[PDB]
């Protein structure tokens, strides 16, 4: 029989690393049906905040307005998604945006020629003033209660160095961007992960002994820290499977064609998660788990 | 279309979660059926995927001007050695996983970068 | 024309690395693979986005209808 208790006995997690952007960990004794659910929720269903509505007031630059709005929608914003609610689309445009669900960013930048530039200068930063527009130039314009709620943490891009646009003297950009909550299954700009995926733990079943110089070349067919030579007997053994990238270079030699079988542990998933910047990868994974549970609970409580 | 006369219309915008994903974590942006090749016989597209993967890995550009290789120095061998010396395999295949069921696919999948 | 904000395949923000890539190519005498690795681009999907960018915006900008030439 299968039971939640029998799953709780055998399931375990091995966090290999954890940063503010990337978290590498393991899920053991779980089914692909649930690991894939977690991965799909991380990529598509976990909400984040991105620029959606752009209100241009002037754009005399070479980049056209739709392209510039698309770029401004792509830049990730360091906003905690819980700090704002969801936009009610059915409401009219006047009352649709409010201080609890919309974040206003502005970008006003004019390019003027630098009258102190040296002769023979080819650097645009020395020839012109504001010849480059960066995501850091996206000022945050708090309105209403967010002037107090966001005082602890001002909204800035996760990558202020993103080169939004370039300018030349006389040219200018003046725009407002409205940032709301959305999910990545709608538009890829709301996806909060650079990439979240997994891979089964590789298995390297050595069938016959590889004693001798053959161990030197057999170990040469894998990533450096995967096969080792035993201190006692000159034998090859599997040190670390996680270090193996499955490239089957050993299979390309008929010497080992009947000495090793390459397989996988069909329940040992190595989740690698990277964050765009708005949330930590561990919190992304936690939110995906919670989303699956909450959607199941909504189905349970829905009348049939 | 590729630079090998492999024209085709876009039939669906496949969502990225439903796209197959590799052991590296990347999901291809173009899917071309393997059945486009056996009758068209555009092996240049295969070797271009191979060379493009090797070049994007080693940070180099490979030339493809005709009649630089021959039957003793095969581009398959050349770009396969370049791929093996980077951690990927000789034949350009990658272990991919189904994005709908999450299981690993039945065989290694031929991937690469083509223009 | 101008560097893309994100990588097409995975979605990693690569729009803040073009100027650094040029700096590491020019000031430091780094080859393209080394510069891409030192920028943090490991997947070839992310490497291609910077390795193959053309940067036509600079050539577009020379035709300025708002300044005397």
């Amino acid at each position: 029989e299968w039971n939640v208790e029998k799953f709780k006995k055998d399931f375990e997690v091995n966090i290999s690393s954890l940063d503010a952007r990337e978290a590498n960990f393991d899920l053991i004794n779980i089914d692909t049906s649930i690991a894939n659910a977690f991965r799909r929720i991380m990529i598509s269903e976990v909400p984040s905040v991105a620029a959606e509505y752009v209100y241009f007031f002037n754009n005399t630059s070479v980049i056209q307005d739709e392209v510039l709005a698309h770029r401004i929608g792509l830049v990730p914003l360091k906003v905690d998604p819980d700090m704002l609610t969801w936009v009610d689309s059915n409401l009219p445009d006047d009352e649709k945006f409010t201080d609890e669900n919309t974040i206003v960013l502005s970008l006003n930048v004019k390019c003027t020629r630098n009258p102190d530039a040296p002769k023979g200068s080819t650097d645009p930063k020395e020839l012109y003033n504001n010849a480059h527009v960066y995501a850091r130039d996206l000022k945050f314009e708090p309105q209403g209660r967010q002037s107090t709620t966001f005082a602890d943490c001002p909204v800035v891009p996760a990558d202020p160095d993103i080169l939004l646009a370039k300018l030349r003297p006389g040219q200018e950009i003046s725009l407002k961007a409205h940032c709301i909550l959305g999910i990545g299954g709608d538009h890829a700009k709301f996806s909060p992960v650079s990439t979240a995926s997994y891979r089964l733990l590789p298995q390297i079943n050595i069938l016959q002994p590889i004693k001798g110089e053959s161990a030197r070349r057999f170990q040469k067919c894998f990533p450096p820290g995967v096969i080792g030579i035993d201190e006692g007997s000159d034998e090859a053994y599997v040190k670390d499977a996680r270090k193996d990238t499955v490239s089957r270079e050993v299979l390309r030699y008929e010497e080992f064609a009947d000495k090793v079988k390459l397989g996988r542990v069909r329940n040992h998933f190595i989740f690698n998660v990277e964050s765009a910047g708005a949330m930590t990868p561990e919190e992304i994974f936690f939110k995906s788990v919670r989303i699956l549970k909450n959607k199941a609970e909504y189905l349970k409580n829905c009348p049939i | 279309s590729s630079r090998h006369g492999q024209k085709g219309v876009c039939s669906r915008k496949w969502p990225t979660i439903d796209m197959p994903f590799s052991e590296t974590g990347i999901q291809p942006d173009i899917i071309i059926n393997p059945h486009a090749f056996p009758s068209r016989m555009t092996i240049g597209m295969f070797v271009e995927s191979l060379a493009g993967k090797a070049g994007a890995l080693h940070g180099i550009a490979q030339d493809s001007t005709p009649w630089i290789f021959n039957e003793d120095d095969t581009p398959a061998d050349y770009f396969g050695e370049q791929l093996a010396k980077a951690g990927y395999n000789y034949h350009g295949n990658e272990p991919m996983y189904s994005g709908a069921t999450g299981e690993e696919l039945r065989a290694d999948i031929y991937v690469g970068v083509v223009y | 024309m101008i560097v893309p904000v994100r990588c097409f395949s995975c979605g990693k923000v690569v729009g803040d690395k073009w100027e650094s890539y040029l700096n590491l190519l020019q000031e430091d005498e780094l080859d393209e693979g080394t510069a891409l690795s030192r920028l943090g681009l490991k997947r070839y999907c992310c490497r291609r986005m910077i390795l193959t960018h053309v940067d036509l915006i600079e050539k577009f900008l020379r035709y300025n209808p708002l300044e005397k030439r």
């Binding site: 990337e22 990533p223 190595i270 690698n272 | 010396k85 980077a86 | -």
Partner: peptide, 19 residues
């Protein structure tokens, strides 16, 4: 005929995720 010039300084670029 001289064979196609083998590029030099080819090192490992692919590593398993998290390493």
């Amino acid at each position: 005929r001289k064979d196609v010039p083998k590029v030099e300084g080819l090192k490992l670029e692919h590593f398993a995720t998290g390493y």
